[PDB]
Design a binder for these strands. Structure first.
Ligand SMILES: Cc1cn([C@H]2C[C@H](O)[C@@H](COP(=O)(O)O)O2)c(=O)[nH]c1=O
Ligand SMILES: Cc1cn([C@H]2C[C@H](O)[C@@H](COP(=O)(O)O)O2)c(=O)[nH]c1=O
Lengths: 211, 211
DNA sequence: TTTTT
DNA sequence: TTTTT
């Protein structure tokens, strides 16, 4: 049974948009971007579509946030599967925000090539717990680094419905090596950072749980 | 309006206990202990009373965890105020667990003086958001370090009731200095570690929010 | 963030 | 962890 948290502090890369589904459900959408100072010292940039659903979507749009505003987001990873109009299954993990608040300081905006900004000195953290969906296999990158792709299923329950989010994690170097023995079905906890390249969790820590 | 998260990976310092209130409410209690490798490289030990309330208390006791088992806890900081039997107001912040799971590996248990164990290579993280309760003032420690005590109120809503948790944070050195300007009422977010000495949040990061 | 001892 | 596009 699942756990699923993402915390992000970042800037709106540009203006958010409010839209409505067929059902009339309100969706608020923003691209939150920043750059983390990853202490060995890397600058890891990231850009995440964040969405707020329902009545909070309309509460959020009332706040009138603009490109460049810095915000903190508390949210979860949302897995979605759909059929493309061109035919064929598609799937993606994005960020659903349970909350978004504005920072009270002007952050430093790093300008990018394609017209957007990202926050300097940002924050990005994920904690998720679910079950490994299949036996992983150790690979090597062109530079020789051990890498392990881990697929897990995070069970969500919310008239009581069940959802599964299929979340992918990358474990590097010694982490990759310590976790080689993981099997289909094994429950696991992973913290890390949420990265673009598709949305993946880059693991900084993984723990195998009992059962 | 509040946010309140604590994540701990640690060992049961000794055997947990199941007890019952006057009302009959089940309380499960454990002392979770470990040691964090704080990357400048300190070993910061900590011992926290963790409690689970209600029917999950009895689910937890069914699991029959013993001194030395390693667990992950997801929880919140719970502020409690009471009158001592000897007369006079008392108050304390402890950890209420929403969840506790057992690790699937044997961790390394560091033995302590008074008969307990603590987990080597543990994890301790807190994120809280609330409003500053009073103007803070910069102090210095005997060694000359800037230190700032920050008091905040985390509003919780749950027939709809309001609770306030009064949580204290310590900000050191440059953090202490960057946050000198905070005023009574200012909303603030703080991540850090949960430390003994009374339970305090040692801030690694603080952000002032708008309003 | 359901709740106390 | 309420929910989709
Ligand atoms: C504005 C924006 C840019 N980008 C990418 C496209 C550009 O190739 C890149 C900008 O280059 P940079 O990362 O070297 O500053 O950022 C996004 O992925 N999402 C966005 O919303
Ligand atoms: C077993 C246990 C010990 N302790 C403290 C009391 C001892 O003075 C100390 C042990 O010394 P140490 O920290 O140098 O190993 O740990 C707790 O605070 N809570 C506990 O549950």
């Amino acid at each position: 049974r699942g756990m699923n948290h993402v915390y992000l502090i970042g800037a709106l890369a540009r203006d958010p948009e409010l839209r409505y589904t067929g059902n009339g459900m309100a969706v608020f959408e923003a691209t939150v971007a920043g750059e983390d100072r990853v202490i060995g010292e890397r600058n890891l940039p990231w850009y995440h579509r964040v969405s707020i659903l329902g009545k909070p979507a309309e509460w959020q749009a009332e706040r009138n946030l603009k490109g460049g505003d810095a915000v903190v987001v508390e949210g979860t990873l949302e897995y979605r599967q759909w059929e493309a109009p061109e035919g064929g299954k598609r799937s993606a993990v994005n960020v659903k925000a349970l909350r978004m608040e504005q920072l009270g300081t002007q952050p430093e905006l790093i300008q990018d090539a394609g017209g957007g900004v990202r926050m300097s000195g940002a924050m990005n953290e994920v904690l998720v717990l679910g079950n490994v969906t299949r036996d992983p296999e150790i690979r090597y990158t062109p530079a020789g680094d051990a890498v392990l792709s881990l697929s897990i299923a995070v069970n969500e329950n919310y008239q009581r419905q069940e959802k599964v989010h299929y979340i992918d994690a990358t474990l590097w170097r010694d982490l990759a090596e310590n976790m080689k023995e993981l099997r289909k079905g094994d429950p696991v906890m992973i913290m890390g950072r949420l990265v673009n390249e598709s949305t993946r969790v880059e693991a900084t820590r993984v723990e195998a749980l009992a059962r």
